[PDB]
Amino acid sequence: TFETRIFDEPELEFGDHHHHQDPRLGLSEAGPLQTFLGDVIKIGVVGN
Amino acid sequence: TFETRIFDEPELEFGDHHHHQDPRLGLSEAGPLQTFLGDVIKIGVVGN
């Protein structure tokens, strides 16, 4: 009667063939999956 | 009797407050007027 299951937490794939389950920690020790070619990202502001 | 004049060759303004009458040499020894804030420019190819 009412068979149950428990699944494990899935793992996300970060850059340099590294995988983890926390987006905060996996980014801070392996970088993004796709690396930006260049150093600068330009931001514009509109307002007061 | 008519009137006549001869104008000098106009000067273009390159980067770093440098002015010259030739785009090629002026770009070769001064650089562009507005420098690219970055390192690389990505080129995509569509063809055979």
How were these coordinates obtained?
A: cryo-EM
How far apart are the C-alpha atoms of A44 and A42, rounded to whole Å? Answer: 7
How far apart are the C-alpha atoms of B27 and B13, rounded to whole Å? Answer: 10
Minimum CA–CA partner of B37 in chain A: A40
For B22, other C-beta atoms within 10 Å of its C-beta total: 13
For B14, other C-beta atoms within 10 Å of its C-beta total: 20
Coil/strand/helix, residue A27:
helix
Contacts of A39 in chain B (CB under 8 A): 38-39
The alpha carbon torsion through A25, A44, B38, B25 (nearest 10 deg) reads 180
Which residues are registered as beta bridge partners of A18?
A: A14
Calculate ∠ Cα A39-A43-A46, nearest 5°.
175
Helix ranges (DSSP H) in chain B: 23-29
Closest C-alpha to A41, from B35, B38, B41, B40: B38
- How many Cα neighbours within 13 Å face the side chain of B5? 3
Say whether B40 and A38 touch across the interface (CB within 8 A): yes
Q: Does A44 touch chain B (CB under 8 A)?
A: no
